[model samples]
Target: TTLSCKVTSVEAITDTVYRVRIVPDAAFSFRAGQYLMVVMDERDKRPFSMASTPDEKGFIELHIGYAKAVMDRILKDHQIVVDIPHGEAWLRDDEERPMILIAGGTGFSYARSILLTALARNPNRDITIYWGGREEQHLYDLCELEALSLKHPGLQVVPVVEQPEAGWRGRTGTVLTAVLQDHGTLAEHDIYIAGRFEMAKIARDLFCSERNAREDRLFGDAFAFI
Candidate 1:
């Protein structure tokens, strides 16, 4: 369940964040919401979510925090070993259920994959993304998402700002609470969550239980923060 690919480019989205795009050899297909890692000392590779969708481009994109491993090594146009594109969380393209995608911080990359997949695969799908962070700056794609909402009637991106400065006028409150208030129940909707480990715990122990989301329809990508 692994594949080999060649690195193409490394571009900085933020001072400390980078997007690395790569191309796999023929027939190395992956699903949206899946993840991979760059080879590291044979046994110490680091895993990160795949932000690019399956289509729309011939290459896959990964948004990750800057690392010497990438700049010093992976940036070269050499080959790299990748684990199988695997994840319990992925899009169900045939299903009719509305989707609720939640993510915090860099976790948004995971959710972004599904959104792009939905757009490419199902343009009219009813989808709502509650991307949460401490402030506006934490929302790296605020402008991009806002533009998307304006053009696509079926997609909505809600920035659940946890703490806002003066004159802030978007949804502001504890992320989970706001999610619950906007969505009184998710008994019939499919859910996907991503974020820091703590937020994932909250989604499982509190948010999912309170919203009555069934396990069969719930999926997520939660990672530990450094």
Candidate 2:
């Protein structure tokens, strides 16, 4: 079965990234870091992370990065149909723990949702977001994150660019390396990584096995396009 969702808004973030908002027919219930399979047609389905948290008003947002393929073409058509509230990676009811969030590319979608929900639920919890892109221009949604950080004293936002352009003066390196440099060790924090398979694997090993973070506390969602 498919859940009906109405397109509420669509705005471009970068040349390849677009933010799409939708309202579900019924009460939308989902955890942060989870994804929904958007069905463009019977055979064309793509998984997009919900950029908005479950407790955020009533709409779901998706930050999609066009990868120059058939899916990009489908999204370019404008109107989209999606299956609501799908996927397993979700927020747990754990309380008041220091958390480290990591994201790569548009994989920031899940991280964004989780951070928003976590902060909304517990305003005092310490949280940090590390978003990685190849260049500063590729790191979309900075204003939204900046606003969130400004509103919440316990939240921090760090943007990393792998290939910095001239005069760029931000965190520079791979996403995982940046996290290690900033946090030193992941032993005391719950780590949530959302990105490609290779990066997820590396994060899992670093945070869960090497740094002594509980295996259960290291949550991840592989944002693969296949």
Candidate 3:
């Protein structure tokens, strides 16, 4: 459905990324892990995963890469057009499987929805989130995830950085390697992943081939297109 949204807030989460909040004109409902499209133009709708969970009513949150033109319109006009509920790899509420969520850079938005919803619905469910970025600064939500982990013993947040400067304490390597080194096999968990197409493809291949993860249990929008 089409939505007329008021751009209420835009806050910098990192040097190159921003967290945007938009209030829709009407009530809207969408499953966790689904995405919405920013109507840049008639032919140029840019897709972004809704970072906020469904339980956080009244507004939708998105983690966006900085674009000068898009930011200008959103800030200057204070309103934007969007189309929502546009993906199939959403959280399955009925399933009792423990979750393994992997994200790269802003792709954490996708996992964030599923993670929060699962925690709210089933606090005891085992969930491990692997969030990776090129540098430590890109793991923007590290502090938040750490605090959340303190409250939920079943939830674990692994922040991975490919290139780490001195004083970086988290895992250092690719997100895939972090997951692989920690988990002997992925056969038991319901895995959800988001990132570049190449990473998704490599993950799907290795997780299934080497880690014993079933292809059907792996969820990612990239799987559909790549």
Candidate 4:
């Protein structure tokens, strides 16, 4: 069913991205990493992954970038129609396997939701997150994510910047290369990926054939089409 939502808040979280918050007219449940379609008009809709965790009551959060037009309209209108609870790349409540979360650019939002839910459910769960970006600025929220990992002994957060700038201390290279270098094999992990389709497609080949990752264990909405 389609529903109208009130725009609660929208602010620039970075130079290129704005964090948008909205509250639906009716309560709805969604899994971590699930996304929603913002109806632009009667026939047009745009998708953005939910950045907030399922634990957050009443409101939903979205990290909006790559679309200045839509973001502007959402700000001007203060109201929007959305079709939600979409996508299959979600955190599993029943599984106990260690998690390997990979994100590129704004795709980190998806990983963020999963991480929070997973931590809330079981703080002791082993989780490693690899967030990558084209430059250091693109890796926004690096310090906060690092702080979160410090608070949770079982969680590790790695920031990878493709182009290293002065004072950059994190890994420098493609995220795929960084991930492959750090881990021996991905067979034993529940791998969740979100980013460019090329990255996910390449990861499927390398992870499955070289790293011995189980096909069934690889989770990503991109996997549906790729």
Screening candidate 1 with a backbone cut-off below 3 angstroms (N, C-alpha, C), the clashing residue pairs are: none
lDDT of each: 0.76, 0.77, 0.90, 0.88
Per-prediction TM-score, please? 0.88, 0.87, 0.97, 0.96
- Per-residue lDDT over 1-226 for candidate 2, one digit per residue giving the tens place of the 0 to 100 score: 3677667777787778877787777776777878888776698677888988887777888776624452354456544567766666677777857988888876788898888889878887799899998888887777778888888888988989988987776788778877767765677787788888788887777766556667777777652321
lDDT of 4 by residue, 141-225 (tens): 8888988988899999989988889789888987888888988988889989999888899998999988899999998889988
Best lDDT among the predictions, by candidate number = 3
Query: What TM-score does structure 3 among the candidates reach?
Result: 0.97
Candidate 4 vs. true structure, TM-score: 0.96
How accurate locally is residue 197 in candidate 4, as Cα lDDT from 0 to 100? 86
lDDT tens digits, residues 65-104, model 3? 8366677778799898999989989998655777999998
Cα lDDT for residue 10, candidate 1: 79
**Candidate 1, 174: how far from true, in Å?**
4.0
Candidate 4: deviation at residue 156, Å? Answer: 0.3
Residue-by-residue lDDT tens digits, candidate 1, 1-226: 5667787877877776777787877666678888887766577776778888877467778776736675566666456677757666778765588888888787777898999888777788789998887877777777898888887788988887878987886788656777788887888888788887777777766755788877667777542221
